[PDB]
Subunit: 126 residues, 4 copies
Amino acid sequence: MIIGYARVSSLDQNLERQLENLKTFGAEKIFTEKQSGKSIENRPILQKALNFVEMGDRFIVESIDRLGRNYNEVIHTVNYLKDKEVQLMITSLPMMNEVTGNPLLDKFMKDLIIQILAMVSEQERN
Amino acid sequence: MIIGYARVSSLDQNLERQLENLKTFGAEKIFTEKQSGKSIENRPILQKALNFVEMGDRFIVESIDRLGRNYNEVIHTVNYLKDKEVQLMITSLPMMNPLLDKFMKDLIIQILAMVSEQERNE
Amino acid sequence: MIIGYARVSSLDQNLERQLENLKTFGAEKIFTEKQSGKSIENRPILQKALNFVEMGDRFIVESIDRLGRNYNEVIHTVNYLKDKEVQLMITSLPMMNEVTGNPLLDKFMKDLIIQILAMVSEQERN
Amino acid sequence: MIIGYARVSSLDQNLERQLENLKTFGAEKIFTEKQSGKSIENRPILQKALNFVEMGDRFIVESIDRLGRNYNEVIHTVNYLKDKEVQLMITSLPNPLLDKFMKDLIIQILAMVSEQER
């Protein structure tokens, strides 16, 4: 199945765009939430969403910053899905998942990319 | 507390150098083994070391290549110690703004993990 | 135009393994050289290929270690193609232009990987 | 000889304190300019500073963003200094082979972040 997760710190942000952008990439069931991306511990909707998907499903976010503005927690979450055999996918970056160059180098590539975005997320909340 | 780990593919490699290298940085209980670092099933010795550490301890190795040559397993081994709050350190590359520094420390270990696998492939 | 370049330090290496590669990817004018890859200063044929290329042209090779086995020199050679506005594309590493879907992150990702390979090229040398 | 470079978009920002930071780490001759770091084409005082430095000298700034907010141009400048053999220090951020690669990467990250803000 294809699960999506949205998030907004306020209604100042365009959430209809965000939700529509998810459904564009085949978002089947979407878990919406309203909270600052400062931590997951206070985000139960995400905890439920992460617990919903099982071996085979796909996780969709509009961006890593929508997942969380916390390098430690995001990368920890990305590893959780990775271990749970659930492909994380980002709509803003619809190429990161395609690459068929070299299996080893493709894993390393994706890791660095997610790590870089995860950093900018926590660096930007400042 | 300190806990070291060593490994060699054969008895042709300088095993003593690695042991002394770990002893140098204050290794107390070193876990040695003779096995190819292609998988972790062959090395329960590592599992016994990962179950040895607690919190505030420090697991050390001469290099990432000695720890393992599998990118997916190595990074998983790093994340093992990460979530247990166990300080990981490399003898060859001892790296002792936190955000940028932690990102950099991770990124380098990822590179060392990758190169370790690419050496075996060729 | 597409220009190629090959290099070997010793015939111990299968030179033909390197020749047939460039010719496959539509190389019109290929150069060949036999020199130690520790320095670019003593490699004239390489420099002649760099003096022949122009704007809009494309420069191709087998790998980074064939452009030299010195980090500072290789990176200097790449930037020489940046400033001269010649697209560099390795055949060994099957990476495509536009890695993710954002020029900046693509710019960073391109440079990062080239720098990594240059390090591996010097790591094998030493 | 150590040379410095300070820049601001307007006098609204703290310029003097930036100059204090430069002269601290040993900024002898300092070039100061008032313009956005969007481009180097509209920054001739930065042209003077880059043409002044030479082999053995040193170029320093408060941060990379002061040097520019354009990944393409910022990376060219650092390489230009690498060609002139002029070490580029950063006030905000003060194994040899690794150290080279490790430094260059830090610059590229900071250079990237600096553009993303603009």
